[PDB]
């Protein structure tokens, strides 16, 4: 499938030989031209206004607009010490787009984050990459060397005079590091604990300085918006959400992978066209749109476009728009057990409900796996999910943790009741004491 730049402004310069694009080929295919336009004839506040007009939203899963985040910094010009972060952690399961992006296109991310720094007067930049991306780190370091030897980073960038430098910090294997405040805390060298709001990271981020963190996909969609105009970017997808998105399916399908699709595309159009359906003798039991932290959906929700507001009233979230399909052979009890086990062993453990209730749900699901369920387990799961909502915990990791649990409860309750076999026996008989027969 040929991806023209008119409707695919992100994946039109890709190579089919699985080889990275260096500085020469990137500069040949419209490299560092819009960045030159912004650094020469366009004010940083005008770039912020262009982002406002384009309606660029966050690609990390929250859906927050980039212009509102960029405009939340204070107007005090004395705070010149400013930091810009690229969230290349990709710690969410079921998401593999950033590895494929970084293995063949580092320079687009570098250019887009350079413009995002110039538009926000950010003097320092960091790419927070996960620690298991070895070849991605090697390619990123080689891109750093090639950009520094060409003058693209450092002092006197093409006569503009803007001082900027980028460093790459590798992760150390924790899922909670992906959150913005926790990424700021882990960048400072402390334990990756999130920070409550108030305060806000736009005011006091990294080391108290103004600091903004953007996703890799957002920082790669920025050059297309800046170079090919704003109204042209608005004229790509005709919906409430404007732009494109990296999309794809994974898990027991014919053609797993990554493609680029505009907003408003229905979820069925990736099944039989891009993925080509599943393997032999597999029934569509469930699917999950936005990685491990999103609600499961059924076949009735498959005919529904992948937007933010479209999934908003559907009882789920768009997430990273990298769905995963669960067939009839995989039981949902074991799947939810594995999801909650991941969310419990990779939780940060700050606040009481997630820290001391996710192991309870994990043990309940372990009992339901072995048939050792007891009457009072599913109700415990509902009570924990109700008491783990947005703001019921310290952050939003735990609402995303128990979104799959409540989704599998709502849609597949009959598979969970089959694990309840023995009656509720919490006490054991003590010889000499008559038990209190509760009714």
């Amino acid at each position: 499938i040929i991806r023209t730049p008119e409707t695919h402004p992100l994946t039109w310069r890709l190579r089919d030989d699985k080889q990275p694009v260096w500085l020469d080929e990137y500069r040949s295919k419209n490299g560092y031209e819009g960045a030159r336009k912004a650094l020469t004839g366009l004010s940083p506040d005008e770039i912020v206004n262009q982002v406002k007009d384009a309606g660029l939203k966050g690609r990390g899963g929250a859906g927050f607009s980039t212009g509102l985040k960029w405009s939340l910094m204070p107007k005090d010009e004395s705070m010149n010490i400013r930091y810009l972060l690229c969230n290349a952690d990709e710690m969410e399961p079921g998401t593999y787009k950033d590895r494929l992006l970084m293995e063949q296109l580092p320079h687009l991310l570098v250019e887009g984050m350079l413009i995002s720094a110039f538009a926000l007067k950010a003097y320092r930049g960091y790419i927070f990459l996960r620690g298991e991306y070895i070849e991605a780190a090697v390619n990123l370091r080689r891109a750093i060397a090639e950009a520094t030897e060409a003058g693209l980073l450092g002092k006197n960038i093409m006569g503009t005079g803007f001082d900027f430098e980028l460093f790459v910090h590798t992760g150390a294997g924790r899922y909670i590091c992906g959150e913005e405040t926790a990424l700021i805390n882990s960048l400072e060298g402390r334990r990756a604990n999130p920070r409550s709001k108030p305060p806000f990271p736009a005011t006091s981020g990294a080391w108290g300085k103004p600091t903004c963190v953007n996703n890799v996909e957002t920082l790669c969609n920025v050059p297309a918006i800046l170079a090919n105009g704003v109204e042209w970017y608005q004229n790509i997808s005709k919906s409430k959400d404007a732009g494109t998105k990296l999309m794809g399916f994974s898990g027991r399908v014919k053609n797993p992978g990554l493609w680029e699709l505009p907003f408003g595309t229905t979820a069925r159009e990736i099944l039989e066209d891009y993925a080509g359906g599943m393997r032999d003798g597999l029934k569509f039991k469930a699917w999950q749109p936005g990685g491990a932290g999103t609600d499961f959906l059924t076949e009735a929700h498959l005919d529904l476009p992948m937007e933010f507001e479209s999934i908003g009233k559907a009882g789920s979230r768009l997430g990273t728009a990298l769905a995963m399909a669960v067939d009839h052979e995989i039981n949902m009890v074991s799947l939810v057990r594995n999801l909650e086990e991941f969310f419990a062993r990779e939780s940060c453990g700050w606040c009481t409900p997630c820290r001391d209730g996710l192991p309870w749900s994990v043990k309940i699901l372990r009992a339901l796996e072995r048939g050792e369920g007891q009457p009072g387990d599913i109700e415990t799961l509902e009570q924990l999910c109700r008491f783990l909502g947005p703001g019921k915990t310290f952050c939003a990791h735990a609402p995303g943790a128990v979104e799959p649990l409540q989704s599998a409860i709502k849609y597949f309750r009959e598979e969970f009741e089959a694990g309840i076999k023995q009656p509720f026996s919490n006490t054991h008989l003590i010889n000499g004491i008559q038990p209190n027969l509760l009714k």
Binding site: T95, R99, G173, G189, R190, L258
Partner: protein, 156 residues
């Protein structure tokens, strides 16, 4: 008995001028010691605290918070098989059973000769080619239980 080498100290200092806070180089210093020795011993926490200036409690908390920084001694090669949801759909249970049959150990334990250490890990970013297994510099994909003895014999 611990002593940071000149190369390790130079690498830690080189990471230290990257950030404006010497505390920010704690994770990278721990990873440097991890690369240069294979694990972080008890004296390494105090050495990193002395070099950086932060207390040893902060370095110990950073080392014990992250899963990819090892505080207990491991073997020559570590095995980090993905056990997340997509690799569960792809069936990592057969891979884990084959690994436990070959190495004759438990997940989290090490072999008697220190040849391998069996560990689970988080998402490896390779869902489309699941299941995946992470050795020191390799991301093995499209795993089958029959190919596990063939894959484990190429590492010594």
């Amino acid at each position: 008995a611990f002593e940071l080498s000149a190369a390790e100290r130079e690498a830690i200092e080189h990471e230290m001028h990257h950030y404006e806070d010497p505390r920010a180089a704690s994770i990278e210093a721990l990873k440097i010691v991890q690369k240069q020795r294979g694990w972080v011993p008890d004296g390494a926490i105090h050495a990193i605290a002395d070099v950086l200036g932060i207390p040893a409690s902060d370095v110990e908390g950073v080392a014990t918070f992250y899963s990819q920084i090892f505080r207990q001694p491991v073997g020559r090669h570590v095995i980090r098989y993905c056990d997340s949801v997509v690799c569960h759909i792809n069936g990592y249970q057969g891979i884990q059973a084959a690994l436990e049959k070959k190495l004759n150990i438990k997940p989290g334990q090490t072999t008697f000769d220190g040849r391998f250490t069996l560990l689970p890990t988080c998402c490896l970013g390779n869902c489309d080619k699941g299941p995946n297994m992470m050795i020191d510099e390799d991301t093995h994909a499209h795993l089958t239980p029959e190919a596990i003895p063939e894959l484990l014999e190429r590492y010594k």
